[PDB]
Symmetry: C3
Subunit: 314 residues, 3 copies
């Protein structure tokens, strides 16, 4: 199988500068090289260049709507293209708003996919529910069919077509949810596993359950959208929205490994890694390193070890 890395150095989705540098940091950490060492064929598609929409006025509260919509429209395009060719897309990005694009494009080629969202937040605020004007917190809203029309059209997202329904997505790691967001997910009956459920069940049962839930009937393509703030700050401190009591490094890797074992990994998102937000270089090295780890995990690397087939090491 083939892998196509795609940088998405974007940051207008939120108010803290730095996330754009994410892809650079990950690459610098030897993501590509390491990935190549896997049983997969890899090709770096470089970092997309986002044209900045001059005079991007704040749609009501939402900020930089046109910049975000265009950047995403450009991504969904690049993504759909590679998916078409039958290669696994890996978007290294800035903020989580780019998920809109990454997923829209993926849906185009595999309209039946499901989405596994590991984040500490739901990012399902509609332009009508956000406190901030931050789009990195509304991604899911632009992708859910059930939310269609539930909020004004947005300057630049005209091109988006609610691809998945609330029955095809599953959260994991929720711990900081806005009232509006809770309302929604409860109303649309969206499956989820907040840290309280992870606590109760254990990452073991969690994955077991999300898999039956999303792949019980039909076996569809999987889209792993990983918000790095999904892990506890102690592992991925360099992020914009650190929230305590999150997923442990192990839990993070257990997830990525099980998804590997399904063999249904079609698309992947590694978002929110902000190099500039580390209090000590260590914090940044740490954040990045596990990001890479989660990635390699997705593509094979087991914690029990791996050996090349047909080779008698003895």
């Amino acid at each position: 199988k083939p892998i196509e890395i795609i940088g998405a150095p974007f940051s207008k989705g939120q108010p803290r500068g730095g996330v754009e540098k994410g892809p650079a940091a990950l690459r610098k950490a030897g993501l590509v090289e390491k990935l190549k060492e896997t049983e997969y064929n890899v090709r770096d598609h470089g970092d997309l260049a986002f044209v900045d929409v001059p005079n991007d006025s704040p749609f009501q509260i939402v900020k930089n709507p046109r910049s975000v919509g265009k950047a995403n429209e450009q991504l969904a395009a690049v993504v759909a293209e590679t998916q078409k060719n039958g290669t696994i897309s890996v978007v290294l990005g800035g903020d989580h708003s780019m998920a809109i694009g990454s997923i829209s494009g993926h849906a185009r080629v595999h309209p039946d996919l499901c989405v596994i969202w590991v984040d500490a937040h739901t990012d399902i605020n509609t332009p009508l529910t956000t406190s901030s004007g931050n789009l990195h917190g509304q991604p899911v809203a632009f992708l859910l069919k059930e939310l269609k029309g539930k909020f004004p059209d947005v300057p630049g997202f005209s091109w988006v077509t609610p691809c998945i329904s609330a029955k095809d997505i599953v959260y994991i790691g929720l711990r900081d949810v806005d009232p509006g967001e809770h309302y929604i997910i409860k109303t649309l009956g969206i499956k989820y596993f907040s840290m309280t459920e992870v606590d109760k069940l254990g990452i073991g049962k969690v994955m077991e359950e999300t898999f039956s839930y999303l792949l019980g009937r039909k076996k569809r393509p999987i889209h792993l959208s990983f918000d790095v703030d999904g892990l506890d700050p102690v592992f991925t401190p360099a992020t914009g929205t650190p929230v305590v009591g999150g997923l442990s490094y192990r839990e993070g890797l257990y997830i990525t490994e099980e998804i590997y074992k399904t063999g249904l990994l079609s698309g992947l998102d590694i978002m929110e890694v902000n190099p500039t937000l580390g209090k000590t270089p260590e914090e940044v090295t740490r954040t990045v390193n596990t990001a890479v780890a989660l990635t390699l995990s997705c593509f094979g690397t087991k914690r029990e070890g791996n050996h090349k087939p047909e080779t008698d090491y003895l």
Copy 2:
């Protein structure tokens, strides 16, 4: 439902100064305010003023017995008063010795209550088993019926009436038990979940089991007596008896949330937070903050999010 916060700035239960400042710290962290944001009606009853008993001689080994017994007798009174009115008591305190009062008063109004004790210790030493005259380590002994007479009467605790038996209390988080203490709990066949049980079962099964055990037959009122040292030092470092390998922040919240879900929370104790014992302001900010969190959890705040009823955020 109504909530009544009660400060118990007491510290004679143990040898390290600072715990009295506990309530102030918690309030300063905006405990009251936040609580108000909950679906509950809150009223701060202020910090009780404890009259210091001059020439409080050490009964054998036990220290400051009269100061402790009077402070508690004063509390049990204030507590019984609010419980009477049908409001939920929340004792913000200094050391865990004030549990005597908090519980005695609570029993008066609900003699059928059960007690969930999250602590790293048992605090069940009788004045005959303590190494240190510290009363903060003997609370349970003064409350257990089965221990009645098993130790000399104590200067000031005359007014106490062993309210609950060993069949109505359950420990959670034990990890530093004195030989005398182990003898007792094993002899009185008291239900408990030490870190080794939590490790074996998982906080999931733990809560499940303590609930069946204490609420299987009849549904009674719940009294949560939370010793802050129940969580690993890494979360609540600012305490007098830090003991490694304790309850994780998550585990702590899971507990408080399940108890919320029973709807049987009648009384609550937030003890041992000592602001002065933090090596770095962070350690104190950290300790306090999660204390508040455990509190808000008890009263609703879910990690999955919360939304106000009858409001269409859409």
Copy 3:
């Protein structure tokens, strides 16, 4: 039962200086004294003195083969001697390469023993698979019967006799395995529980399973070879091969306690504690302290508490 502490201040098994100081550090932490406080009879056999083999040339890649083989031959001797007498051997050592000796000697007296290997690595590289001539990474290879002849004889290990087979050993905590090592363990069908299994099952089921696997049919003696890097660097930072996302302090203790409860603890190894590798004195105090704890755990100390029999504390 009797306990015999044996220091093995060795370090030629690997390239970082300091591990020889391990025993000193552990003793200085009051290991002996504390052990004495247990229901066990203890005797310190002091630290063996290892004669350095001059002009120890690198057998191909392997480094200091003769120094290592001799030091081990000297240990297996000292060990076999105490085992003979019917006392439990506790090897406090430098690097994990001394496991060769500790186990060989133990096998002599109890050829039916089983080995529980808690380490973050497998240390099963044959002199033909190692990237680094480091012997501390090949211990298991010199002990497995199934590996006999699968690699050239080594200058000084002539005296070793593959005592156990792949059906009598069980790993716990694996997370950094070399390709060669993975090949082997997969080829020899060796039972193991890498962190991913621990994640799936929980330390509870893990121990339960390893016990049924190794003690299902016959009840044999247990040899606990504990590599300190088995625990996450956040607990035992002072080691040469720190690897993230490892065994939690609790998990570590849970293991040692269960093995205590089988009553089949015959031999024990506390390896890799390197006092000189701590970034801050705290890291070293921390590493050592838990080492001691895992030890006392093996010999009784429960997290739920312990009380002396026949004594009425009341």
